Design an enzyme around this catalytic site. Structure first.
Site, short mmCIF file in Angstrom:
data_model
loop_
_atom_site.label_atom_id
_atom_site.label_comp_id
_atom_site.label_asym_id
_atom_site.label_seq_id
_atom_site.Cartn_x
_atom_site.Cartn_y
_atom_site.Cartn_z
N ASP A 142 -3.52 5.02 -3.23
CA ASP A 142 -4.55 5.39 -2.52
C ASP A 142 -5.55 6.62 -3.56
O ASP A 142 -6.69 6.61 -3.13
CB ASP A 142 -4.21 6.05 -1.28
CG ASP A 142 -5.15 5.65 -0.27
OD1 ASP A 142 -6.58 5.56 -0.58
OD2 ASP A 142 -4.87 5.67 1.01
N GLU A 155 4.50 8.94 -1.26
CA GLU A 155 5.50 8.65 -0.89
C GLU A 155 6.63 9.05 -1.91
O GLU A 155 6.56 9.13 -3.22
CB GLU A 155 5.74 7.20 -0.72
CG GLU A 155 4.74 6.38 0.05
CD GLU A 155 4.19 6.69 1.26
OE1 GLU A 155 5.25 7.64 1.72
OE2 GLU A 155 3.08 6.47 1.99
N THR A 212 0.78 -1.34 0.10
CA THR A 212 0.22 -0.13 -0.03
C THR A 212 0.73 1.37 0.11
O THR A 212 1.66 1.41 0.82
CB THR A 212 -0.85 0.08 1.24
OG1 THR A 212 -0.15 -0.01 2.25
CG2 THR A 212 -1.90 -1.19 1.31
N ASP A 250 -6.40 -4.67 11.78
CA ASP A 250 -5.53 -5.79 11.21
C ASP A 250 -5.30 -6.67 12.73
O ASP A 250 -5.18 -7.84 12.39
CB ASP A 250 -3.86 -5.47 11.09
CG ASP A 250 -3.35 -6.33 10.27
OD1 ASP A 250 -3.90 -7.35 9.97
OD2 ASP A 250 -2.06 -6.10 10.08
O1 LIG Z 1 -4.79 7.67 4.21
C1 LIG Z 1 -3.64 6.83 3.62
C2 LIG Z 1 -2.56 6.83 4.67
C3 LIG Z 1 -1.59 5.77 4.60
N1 LIG Z 1 -1.98 4.95 3.61
C4 LIG Z 1 -0.90 3.89 3.44
O2 LIG Z 1 -1.01 2.78 4.60
C5 LIG Z 1 0.03 2.72 5.42
C6 LIG Z 1 -0.02 3.41 6.57
O3 LIG Z 1 1.27 3.55 6.98
P1 LIG Z 1 2.11 4.85 7.09
O4 LIG Z 1 3.29 4.79 6.26
O5 LIG Z 1 1.02 5.90 7.01
O6 LIG Z 1 2.29 4.95 8.69
P2 LIG Z 1 4.01 4.70 9.44
O7 LIG Z 1 4.64 3.66 8.63
O8 LIG Z 1 4.39 6.12 8.75
O9 LIG Z 1 3.97 4.90 10.72
C7 LIG Z 1 1.19 3.26 4.50
O10 LIG Z 1 1.48 2.17 3.55
C8 LIG Z 1 0.65 4.26 3.70
O11 LIG Z 1 1.30 4.62 2.48
C9 LIG Z 1 -3.22 4.68 3.05
O12 LIG Z 1 -3.33 3.59 2.32
N2 LIG Z 1 -4.08 5.76 3.13
#
Ligand SMILES: O=c1ccn([C@@H]2O[C@H](COP(=O)(O)OP(=O)(O)O)[C@@H](O)[C@H]2O)c(=O)[nH]1
Ligand SMILES: O=c1ccn([C@@H]2O[C@H](COP(=O)(O)OP(=O)(O)O)[C@@H](O)[C@H]2O)c(=O)[nH]1
Ligand SMILES: [Mn+2]
Ligand SMILES: [Mn+2]
Lengths: 761, 761
Positions: free
Chosen positions: A213, A163, A159, A418
């Site tokens: 997304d 990024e 996902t 999860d």
């Molecule tokens: O609105 C959102 C924000 C994040 N993500 C994704 O879902 C995961 C959320 O983990 P994130 O990286 O935001 O948390 P972290 O690893 O930064 O603490 C990552 O793959 C994000 O790219 C998503 O699908 N939708």
């Protein structure tokens, strides 16, 4: 009256006296909207957008527009026949057409086992209308794996949302390294894998599915990288998605990656860029439902974007899955990349310590009992036999059923779902699926380096963790009621449920317990002369009470400011205030740590004292030394202990602060349509307002319960209990919890190092 | 492998079967043409406008309704505008072409055969005039050719009244219009040739022509459908006419004009010259006043301009008293009428309505009399205020609408001050350069409004009121130097303004620490008279010595818990789902008040009533009754003193906490356009996020300053001051404030009752 006459005379004198491609795209978009609203006459008219423009000198654009016009004319003929009735069909939609264009960049110098030119050089893409990803296979959508006959046994999801290219490139390089490691296994030996994951062919049986997304939020540099690796094309997207009105666009390319003089293994990749922004839950909805229901993998792995896996993460996960045959899901260790480097940052080191301790202690204890609450963002994998039905249905209940029916309790529960999927896997009816935690499958992620980013991250983590914990506590009866576990497994689950209840109850009163511990030990040893290394018997008698008064006022003012800020502004413009509060709490805890060390060293070290001190604090170092990684704790202990109060107070407060943060008619007919649209708009606004009211009311009620329970507990302990009649209780409770966690870690280690020899029995 | 082969064979078998116009159509095409013309795409605009015009011309024949047929034929005007635009595209040179204005009058559906009027022509009596307006910046309303029926007929209004209405029932609007007709009848019935009555433009038998009542709606999406039905009933709104004639114009608002005739029972009300400007898009009351003032005032150029909210019922002599003040003084730059709760005697069982009535009466009498003595009034929000269009023409209105003219990003969060900018208009009128305009308070021009009867509605209303009052007060305090710097006032006026500025600074400083002062007063008097045996009517010398400290501890803990809960709830969720919690806190504070009230009465009655004590008590509390008896209305205070006393702490604490707590292109061109739109959207999102960040940061900073100043003041008084060394100071301060307010009320009364006889000198 003269100005009036002048002005009015002034007013009196002032009283006297070839088509286009963009047009085609707009008309096709309007036709798609009309077809969405089920107006088939207008849809047919506007679709007949469908050939004159394809004037273009660019061969690729000319071919794309010619093909699009031909396809749109064929679809118009189909819809005209459908309206005429000679062809009867339910819910007509434009035919599914995937277009393969030659890739812009292909490396002449590249090494591979064997490949065909059509798969290697050409990139396939298809826009999909699928509103409910369950009938993805029903509408005729297929993937290149299905078309070529490749039958992937494992699928992986990445996902990605807003990024930079570096994170995605690191993730893909790490996946290629994993595939290379899987290729290089020696055959004909006991330890290595056998079967579908052997060498020279492993890259075909693994599919990496990248789910974006939102087309409006992905990074332009990210899209440039995706075009560079030959997996994205803006012109192709715009031409071939003009009138289909696709919800998500998926591109397929078994991309070839090269790093320096070493060419990585080809990766079977599917990239589903979805048009409208949604949640990670919706990304998993698309991934799981559509792609899993189509190709039906044997194991299903999920990781976020930016998680770098070692050479043996996938190998260890698959080894566990094959050798156990009972695991319904597992997750790898979560580690901060480059922990030794950049040791000057306190937040990074504290996060490293938290990850290492959480993993070792909690995950080992939970994997001993076969039920693990996976960390959010961890590289977790399941097998698609324990997730097929009811677990996934419960997982996506939030998307399937609108939040109004479920309530705020369920929504906050599904913020980090999860854990809900893990519990549903554990307690699936008529099946005994346990969970597992793989120590060696380390997945390195990149945590935020700033206190504000840490605050937001831990807010979401704690929200999901708390309400998933409530879900598990309230529904733990399902394991015995529905599942068919062994009697030993049921008793182990009951013991773990008792431990989980005690641990959650202790963690709920964590701020009050921390305040009481600091207050009693430090300040009522200083005021009441209990610090064994100093004699404060007489003193000035002003400083003696001044210490306690200063500590109480500072703590109360800090808590009030924290509550106000957490309730109010987004913690990004309050960086200075949050850093100030965190620094104050950190300095207070360094003072407390030196005071406690002095007390412990000056005490004559009785047997009970040394046993309690070991079993309470040195449990971290004991478990770390048992697991073989103790240098991390040795380096990060001070950094984390400097951040314990910030963690507890700030993170718990902010997480509890925003529980509501969740995602041919005539003129009479025209007037009736306008009135109906206005009424529907008003009803939607009222329903949204009611949703917000219920969500905020639940947030405020739960926050008030938590804060006032902590305050009442602290006041009733301070006023009605002395340090001699409470601190032994606190030491006993903390020692019991750390004893259970130490026993869990010991059991996990002995299981890992013993089950190999005792595999015969 | 068998089920896998079965499923893949199933997919293989599923593989077979990769490489006459309309009026709604006319309205949609005209809307698209309006959008294209707004985007300055003249070729597309001409094409779509031509299509819409021909579609309407063809459709109009098939309509059976004569009115719709004729109206659609007339609208199919669009063809003439098409010819004009085609000529513009160079034989006719014109800057920013737009469809020519066209006002169409249809006969009203209902006309009363039995009606009595002085004299009127059929064209104005039986026909209703309507015209849609594009004017975006309402200054050039007269420049674009827009005229009102008053200007067209030559009637030259001198007083123009605004009635802002938004989401309101028909009853409020009907009451307001009936009251306005009563005022017009009273103005008619003045006896000529006497000293008291007005002379000139407001004489009898013709005053209805010189007064225009301008109703300004706020959004066609939010006005009440019953309100619209009532507007049709009085013959001032037509949905069909609006929907047709506003098709391609793209009007920002729609104005209807009608000299509406109103009948009540057997008495026929006077005709009211009415203009109803209904805004298409929702905006603020500030934008409603922007439209009203700029467009209509700059057009008809009145002599006095009055502003009222909807639902405010005026007595028979409100307008007479306002105009008497304006004519006889010749210096008043603006005046505000008394605000009164309708039916205060009735429903005396409701405590909130009574408390609001008491607050209105005391605020009016004391504060407004004191301010009108010194010629500067902070107008109460929602009050019926009027100005003369000679002191408001330029810089005052420019400052008033600075928020609309300049976006809030440049101005900042402080300026966004303009939440309630009627006080800002007042200050700008007072301190206008090179002219000396003062204000006045008309006691006899009572405007009866309808207050909320629920604590939650009171909370929201008082949040708005306190927000505006506090930041307008800060503006006046900071910019009070402008009166001497720029204006040309008399030296005595400058000295009076300086004295009032000193008083205002002291009063605002006291009101800022109002929660802390209230807590300290209650704590000291009640609980440190009970604990330390100072209640003269009881001897608590020995007692149990456990309840003596228990009273103070219970009061302190209850007050602190209530304050924390109030902060969290107010600053968090919307006070509509917490009705039970807010009522609980209000009841707790009301009971605490009751206890404090009776304790204070007992202390006063048991004290031997020395001269200093009786003077201070009179001048402090009985100042309300003294001023009320002086003004002749004392029964209201006599009946409502207890009701308001029960709500003092709820008022101060809750309302202050909530108010402060919520402060012909090719594909390359097409792709470039998409990228530009994406970048513009991203920049707009970032700008909105920055606005919200600054806005919330300033909110939290001011809230923290207020709350922590109050807490620090309370703690420093409690710990470092006794009741004997602080309460005399508090009594002196409050006595001084009430002395100033009493002297102001006495001065206002003597001015009103003396200026008539001493008018010669
Ligand atoms: O609105 C959102 C924000 C994040 N993500 C994704 O879902 C995961 C959320 O983990 P994130 O990286 O935001 O948390 P972290 O690893 O930064 O603490 C990552 O793959 C994000 O790219 C998503 O699908 N939708
Ligand atoms: O978004 C809004 C809300 C209100 N109003 C009107 O402007 C005035 C605001 O006063 P409100 O009714 O809010 O105050 P109240 O009388 O309720 O205390 C009233 O005439 C409202 O109808 C408006 O123009 N826009
Ligand atoms: Mn991440
Ligand atoms: Mn109102």
């Amino acid at each position: 009256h003269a100005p009036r006459s002048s002005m009015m005379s002034v007013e009196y004198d002032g009283i006297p006296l070839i088509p286009s491609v963009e047009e085609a795209l707009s008309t096709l978009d309007r036709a798609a909207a009309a077809l969405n609203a089920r107006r088939y006459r207008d849809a047919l008219k506007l679709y007949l957008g469908g050939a004159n423009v394809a004037r273009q000198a660019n061969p690729k654009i000319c071919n794309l527009l010619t093909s699009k016009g031909f396809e749109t004319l064929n679809w118009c003929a189909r819809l005209c026949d459908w309206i005429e009735g000679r062809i009867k069909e339910k819910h007509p939609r434009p035919g599914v057409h995937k277009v393969g264009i030659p890739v812009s960049n292909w490396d002449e110098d590249w090494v591979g086992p064997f490949m065909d030119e059509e798969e290697a050089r050409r990139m396939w893409y298809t826009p999909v209308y699928c509103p409910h990803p369950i009938d993805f296979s029903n509408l005729g959508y297929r993937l290149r794996c299905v078309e070529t006959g490749r039958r992937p046994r494992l699928m992986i999801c990445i996902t990605m949302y807003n990024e930079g290219p570096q994170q995605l490139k690191a993730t893909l390089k790490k996946l290629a390294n994993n595939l290379a490691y899987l290729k290089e296994q020696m055959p004909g030996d006991e330890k290595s894998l056998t079967g579908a994951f052997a060498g020279d062919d492993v890259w075909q049986n693994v599919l990496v599915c990248i789910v974006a997304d939102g087309r409006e939020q992905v990074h332009p540099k990210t899209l440039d990288y995706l075009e560079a690796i030959g997996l994205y094309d803006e012109d192709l997207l715009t031409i071939n998605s003009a009138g289909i009105g696709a919800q998500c666009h998926l591109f397929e390319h078994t991309l070839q990656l090269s790093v320096n003089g070493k060419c990585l293994l080809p990766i079977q990749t599917v990239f589903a860029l979805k048009e409208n922004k949604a949640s990670k839950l919706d990304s998993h909805h698309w991934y799981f439902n559509a792609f899993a229901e189509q190709i039906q993998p044997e194991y299903t792995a999920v990781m976020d974007v930016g998680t770098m896996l070692t050479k043996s993460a996938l190998y260890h996960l698959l080894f566990a899955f094959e050798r156990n045959h009972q695991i319904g899901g597992a997750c790898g260790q979560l580690t901060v990349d480059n922990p030794f480097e950049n040791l000057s940052n306190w937040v990074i080191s504290a996060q490293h310590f938290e990850y290492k301790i959480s993993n070792i202690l909690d995950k080992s204890l939970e994997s001993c009992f076969g039920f693990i609450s996976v960390l959010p963002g961890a590289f977790s994998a399941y097998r698609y036999e324990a997730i097929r039905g009811a677990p996934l249905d419960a997982y996506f209940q939030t998307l399937n059923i609108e939040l109004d029916v479920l309530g705020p309790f369920i929504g906050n529960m599904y913020l980090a779902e999860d854990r809900i999927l893990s519990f549903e896997v554990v307690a699936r009816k008529n099946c005994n699926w346990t969970m597992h935690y793989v120590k060696d499958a380390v997945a390195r992620t990149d945590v935020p380096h700033d206190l504000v980013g840490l605050i937001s991250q831990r807010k979401r983590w704690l929200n999901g963790a708390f309400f998933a914990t409530l879900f598990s506590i309230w529904n733990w009866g399902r394991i015995y009621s529905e599942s068919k576990h062994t009697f030993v497994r049921k008793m182990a689950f009951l013991v773990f449920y008792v431990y989980h209840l005690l641990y959650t109850a202790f963690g709920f009163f964590l701020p009050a317990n921390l305040y009481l511990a600091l207050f009693f030990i430090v300040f009522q040893g200083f005021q009441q002369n209990r610090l064994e290394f100093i004699d404060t018997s007489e003193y000035s008698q002003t400083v003696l009470d001044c210490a306690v008064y200063i500590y109480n006022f500072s703590y109360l003012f800090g808590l009030l400011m924290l509550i106000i800020i957490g309730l109010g502004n987004n913690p990004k413009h309050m960086k200075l205030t949050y850093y100030f509060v965190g620094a104050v709490f950190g300095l207070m805890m360094m003072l407390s740590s030196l005071v406690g060390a002095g007390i412990f060293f000056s005490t004559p070290a009785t047997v009970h004292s040394i046993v309690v001190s070991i079993l309470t604090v040195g449990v971290y170092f004991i478990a770390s030394a048992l697991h073989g990684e103790v240098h991390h704790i040795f380096m990060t202990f001070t950094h984390y202990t400097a951040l314990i109060p910030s963690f507890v107070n700030i993170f718990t407060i902010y997480s509890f602060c925003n529980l509501q943060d969740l995602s041919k008619g005539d003129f009479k007919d025209v007037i009736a349509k306008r009135r109906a649209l206005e009424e529907l708009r008003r009803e939607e606004k009222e329903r949204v307002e009611n949703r917000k009211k219920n969500f905020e009311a639940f947030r405020t009620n739960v926050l008030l319960t938590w804060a006032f329970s902590n305050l009442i507990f602290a006041l009733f302990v301070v006023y009605f209990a002395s340090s001699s009649t409470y601190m032994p209780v606190l030491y006993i409770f903390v020692a019991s919890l750390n004893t259970c966690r130490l026993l869990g870690s010991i059991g996990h280690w002995v299981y890992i190092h013993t089950e190999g020899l005792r595999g015969r029995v």
